[PDB]
């Protein structure tokens, strides 16, 4: 191993995923995962190939990850979501948008069938929804326009009609939250923005693909954008990105994410405080506020974003964002305590199971690989391939749990033009060796051989490192999937 790890370092849990980035994220709960959807941020270049800020050029895909434990995420790659002008190369699902920015996520039981809603804004084009049988997809434009517009009833006064945030709620009842923006275009006054009045909820009819009544005003003092609710012991909790113009008061932080509370889901709600500082208060980067709070395994959490891999990259964030999870902590009295940001993030809350099919593009650390779509038959939905492999890259799994028994051997998909090989080590790159793969030629980058080799000294739980050795200077292998068999 002689590759380095990007921002998220062995041992730490964020950024959540730094071989990509990945901006306003937020979560879906389901079935024992945690799944992270997010706009697609990509490295944007001048014509001379260096490095420029992010213009949200790029910004028409939805990006899809999963843990089961916090540590270990499942790159299950990208929606194509917007399909005007071009795609998406043809591809892209809802035709009449450009954009795809800021999704959200929900799930509901619809004719004893749980149905899968991803929501994004259109730029500030309207807020569309695309529908699925499974959280990864494949995905169903089934309006063919925004579900809700400027000329959507009590949406007119919204300056930027986006960040949508979707909750079904306990009685089944979905609601839509979204709107940001100031009123007075280039100098508002203190007042508009103190209470800009842009914020926005209305309630989803029963199939989650159409509005009922009219939209309901959120006075959420100092709003910018970032809507946000959950609901925790009865009470809902609206939060949001405060804005940075004007006088604020010291309870109303420019940039950090203030929150309100209600009895009902449409309000009235009343300011409370606020509970995340802007990202640069904690990393490198700079950075606008963008989160979603979720119970996951039966723990509170935030998802927010940072510029933590651009900024280890180019020395600055450049508006490139990467999500990151930490615990969010409700007082007796229904507070919220500050959210501790930091790189530790969240400790691994359960082990990995070596012996089931185990995605290569599921891991918790990497020297420096890619992810793409795969050419392999099978797999999973949106099924991807780790990619970009030079020789001393490596990826890493968190507490893979050998058992007392341990493992007899180890199974590797493989596609490789050259050849090449797979070290399997414990606990670190240069760490006990209890395997090396040898990748043959198989063909080359999209045939695809599943290969088996001998195992010993894999029992109980450690970290497990992949690293990739080759003589060849570009790309030595694709690596699908592996599996560990039981002694
Ligand atoms: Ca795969
Ligand atoms: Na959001
Ligand atoms: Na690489």
Not at 467 to 479: H, P, R
């Amino acid at each position: 191993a002689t590759s380095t790890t990007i921002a998220k370092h062995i041992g730490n849990s964020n950024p959540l995923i730094d071989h990509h980035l990945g901006a306003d994220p937020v979560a879906l709960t389901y079935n024992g995962r945690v799944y992270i959807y997010m706009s697609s941020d990509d490295y944007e270049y001048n014509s001379n190939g260096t490095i420029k800020d992010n213009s949200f050029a790029n910004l028409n895909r939805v990006f899809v990850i999963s843990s089961a434990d916090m540590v270990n995420w499942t790159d299950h790659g990208a929606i194509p979501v917007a399909g005007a002008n071009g795609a998406n190369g043809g591809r892209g699902i809802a035709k009449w948008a450009g954009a795809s920015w800021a999704p959200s996520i929900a799930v509901k039981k619809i004719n004893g069938k749980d149905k899968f809603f991803l929501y994004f804004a259109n730029s500030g084009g309207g807020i569309g929804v695309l529908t699925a049988d499974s959280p990864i997809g494949p995905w169903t434009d089934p309006i063919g326009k925004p579900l809700v517009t400027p000329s959507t009833p009590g949406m007119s006064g919204v300056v930027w009609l986006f960040d949508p945030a979707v909750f079904v709620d306990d009685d089944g009842t979905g609601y839509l939250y979204a709107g940001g923006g100031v009123p007075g275009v280039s100098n508002p006054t203190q007042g508009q923005w103190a209470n800009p009045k842009t914020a926005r909820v209305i309630k989803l009819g029963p199939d989650m693909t159409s509005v009922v009544g009219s939209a309901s005003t959120i006075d959420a003092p100092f709003m910018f954008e970032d809507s946000g609710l959950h609901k925790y012991n009865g009470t809902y909790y609206y939060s949001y990105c405060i804005n940075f113009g004007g006088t604020h008061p010291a309870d109303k932080p420019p940039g950090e994410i203030g929150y309100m509370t209600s009895s009902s889901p449409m309000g009235p709600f009343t300011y409370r405080g606020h509970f995340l500082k802007n990202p640069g208060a904690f990393f490198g980067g700079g950075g606008n506020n963008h989160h979603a709070v979720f119970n996951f395994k039966n723990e509170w959490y935030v998802v927010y974003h940072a510029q933590t891999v651009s900024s280890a990259l180019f020395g600055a964030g450049k508006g490139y964002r990467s999500p990151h999870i930490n615990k969010l902590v409700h007082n007796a009295d229904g507070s919220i305590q500050e959210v501790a940001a930091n790189y530790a993030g969240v400790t691994q809350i359960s082990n990995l199971n070596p012996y089931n099919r185990v995605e290569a593009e599921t891991f918790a650390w990497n020297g420096r690989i890619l992810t793409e779509k795969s050419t392999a038959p099978g797999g999973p939905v949106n099924n991807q391939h780790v990619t970009s492999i030079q020789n001393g890259d490596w990826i890493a799994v968190g507490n893979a749990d050998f058992g007392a028994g341990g493992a007899r051997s180890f199974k590797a998909n493989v596609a490789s033009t050259l050849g090449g090989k797979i070290e399997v080590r414990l606990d670190s790159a240069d760490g006990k060796l209890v395997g090396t793969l040898n990748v043959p030629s198989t063909g080359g980058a999209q045939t695809w051989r599943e290969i088996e080799t001998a195992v010993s000294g894999a029992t109980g739980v450690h970290k497990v490192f992949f690293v990739f050795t080759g003589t060849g200077t570009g790309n030595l292998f694709n690596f699908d999937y592996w599996q560990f068999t039981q002694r």
